[PDB]
């Protein structure tokens with residue numbers, strides 16, 4: 030039988046705590062023997078049994094105070110031990126098999142290395158334990174292994190003992206002084222190259238930094254090391270937080286379901302978020318390494334020193350740590366580009382989740398499989414909620430709140446409500462209504478109407494809000510929405526906001542279903558900028574004229590507003606042209622719209638970083654969110670037609686800006702990255718110029734590129750525009766790079782997202798490619814996941830072939846690696862957003878999956894919601 034849902038309202042403090050655990054691993058890939066000696070204390074009723082979680086363990090023995098115990102039973106997922114004293118020593122010996130662990134949860138093999146992933150509930154795959162994050166224990170870990178195969182034996186904390194044994198084995202013992210929940214346990218065993226460096230904290234603590242990579246990869250490690258030092262310095266400067274241990278280890282592994290993991294003092298990272306060299310990694314890879322290194326470092330305080338009482342509180346650490354990583358990237362780099370791209374993710378991907386059958390509040394109320402809740406909502410919307418607190422409080426108050434949060438909760442497992450209370454108490458800002466953001470799912474819609482009264486020189490905004498019902502929640506209530514505005518006069522000058530002789534804050538508190546805001550001394554009919562810096566995670570309904578939007582593109586003070594105005598301008602014409610496509614009619618675009626983009630190209634005063642984003646059209650997933658019923662073929666074809674029309678109308682300006690932004694030196698420096706992003710944004714359109722001009726330009730860039738950013742931009746353009754050189758360039762890239770999986774992932778993505786008519790045949794054939802394997806999550810995501818999630822036009826082919834392909838892949842992955850399967854099923858659970866014929870085929874696919882033998886809980890949860 031499938032597992033039953035668990036509910037946030039059922040939280041109960043544990044009947045037993047474990048204060049200290051001494052682990053011994055006698056390591057082997059086929060068989061590992063685990064000995065766990067735990068010091069336990071009863072907190073609950075004297076007759077309560079100890080209920081330990083365990084999965085796929087071979088129990089060898091149970092002792093209580095060294096007495097072999099008879100009062101125990103194994104049940105599904107558990108070991109239940111009765112008749113215990115109030116305080117006692119529990120000793121469990123059990124066996125596990127890392128080589129059999131294809132799910133990559135618990136202790137498993139990554140190539141020749143052994144490594145762990147314990148979040149959320151993986152430690153119970155290692156031993157029988159209280160695998161819940163409000164149980165905080167001091168760990169000591171002894172690792173015994175063959176010395177030749179496993180010369181490095183790592184766990185959390187500091188090395189406290191080591192020895193050698195007969196028959197070529199050796200051992201190391203680690204001690205981590207900070208009590209932790211078991212999801213933060215890590216173990217690594219293998220042979221590695223190690224990059225070693227040092228960071229000295231502002232108070233003088235010297236921290237040894239160690240980055241473990243596969244042999245031969247040292248020259249790909251310096252950027253990650255530099256980013257770790259940058260993260261440590263920034264957390265000191267911005268948050269006043271120092272690292273708290275003596276060593277900081279990071280291990281890069283090739284086989285990893287997640288991007289990275291914040292295990293205390295021993296982070297484990299997917300190699301994608303560590304390894305970089307300029308010929309193999311793009312600017313985006315460099316900035317993603319920076320943000321993920323930062324994210325995991327920032328968890329040391331927001332997640333580790335203060336952890337989560339229960340898994341429904343996941344956003345307590347994830348929303349806050351994502352906010353921290355965004356602030357880090359934004360401070361060091363381009364704040365406008367960071368904000369823009371985070372808003373693209375919110376509007377184009379998280380909004381889709383929040384109206385889907387999987388919709389949940391950032392603090393869920395009901396979960397079947399927790400590892401399904403590591404979501405865009407919990408992370409990205411979670412961060413938007415933190416950012417709204419920051420908007421309401423300001424930086425100084427926000428940092429006072431952080432300080433009070435740590436003062437109260439350091440060394441504990443806390444709740445979202447605890448965090449909000451700390452912010453409220455430190456700042457004196459009332460967040461009682463604001464708390465509804467934690468409990469209500471769905472995207473609010475904010476509708477704005479305006480009126481300018483020339484007789485009284487008053488401007489009035491009438492603002493309404495509503496959240497449509499979602500499948501998880503029938504009751505919706507108004508939220509406390511921080512709604513930032515700016516008003517512009519006819520010369521683009523800001524109009525001071527005031528009423529009754531007093532200044533009015535530009536962040537309006539939209540707290541009611543409907544309310545009005547009156548501003549006086551408004552000497553001219555304003556052009557408003559609304560929802561500035563995306564001040565709340567909402568859909569905005571305001572009846573813009575095209576002229577208001579092009580005005581904002583020329584005059585708005587914040588770069589984000591200029592980009593956002595361009596998005597609103599495009600939205601009207603994307604919608605127009607999708608409707609036209611459905612009636613067989615070609616693209617129609619007023620001249621004045623093309624001219625707004627011409628002006629961006631020719632404006633010497635605009636930051637190239639901003640111009641590049643304005644000249645990057647919304648993705649097909651961003652476009653889908655504009656529509657009640659998604660027509661993925663119309664969207665894809667309109668996106669191409671819009672690209673072609675702009676390429677034709679702007680051909681001379683695009684080429685001039687492309688050439689003007691040429692850089693002979695390659696540097697991973699923000700100003701250079703911006704110029705390159707602008708040059709390559711122009712290239713996307715130039716690829717749709719006259720076929721031969723485009724073919725020459727694109728092939729030249731590919732062959733002359735001195736860095737992977739420019740080479741991949743050219744290759745992507747050859748695929749997108751189906752240029753003559755495409756097949757030759759794609760083969761050259763394969764021949765050069767086939768032994769490098771991270772580099773080939775880029776090529777698999779291009780294959781999977783190709784506009785070619787035969788894309789599915791190509792994708793299917795690539796299941797046999799020398800660089801592809803179903804054993805590697807990165808390869809799976811880059812080929813299969815990109816097809817289903819990033820090529821909706823082909824995934825939603827009207828013959829249903831895309832659904833049948835995904836069913837085949839999920840039939841394999843349901844058994845092999847359910848976490849990856851559950852990420853890959855997401856496109857099918859969006860069926861109610863599609864036309865009836867597509868829904869019928871998608872339902873049939875889901876019903877096939879529902880009937881699988883040994884259906885994983887991961888997929889069961891999503892399938893059940895989708896078929897309801």
Ligand SMILES: [NH3+][C@H]1CCc2ccccc2CC1(O)O
Pocket residue numbers: 148287288289290291324325328347403404408
């Ligand atoms: N705590 C981990 C959990 C794994 C995971 C899943 C989804 C996005 C990011 C991450 C990285 C993380 O650091 O947040």
Ligand SMILES: [Cl-]
Pocket residue numbers: 057058059060
């Ligand atoms: Cl073995």
Ligand SMILES: [Cl-]
Pocket residue numbers: 241242243246281282283300
């Ligand atoms: Cl590696």
Ligand SMILES: [Cl-]
Pocket residue numbers: 365586587588589
């Ligand atoms: Cl700005």
Ligand code: NA
Pocket residue numbers: 094117118
């Ligand atoms: Na004892």
Ligand code: NA
Pocket residue numbers: 358359360361362363364
């Ligand atoms: Na910055």
Ligand code: NA
Pocket residue numbers: 150397398399886
């Ligand atoms: Na589970």
Ligand code: NA
Pocket residue numbers: 148149286287400403848
């Ligand atoms: Na997981």
Ligand code: NA
Pocket residue numbers: 478479480
């Ligand atoms: Na009006």
Ligand code: NA
Pocket residue numbers: 479572
């Ligand atoms: Na208006």
Ligand code: NA
Pocket residue numbers: 534535536
């Ligand atoms: Na302001």
Ligand code: NA
Pocket residue numbers: 796797798799800801802
């Ligand atoms: Na292969």
Ligand SMILES: [Zn+2]
Pocket residue numbers: 324328346347350
């Ligand atoms: Zn995280």
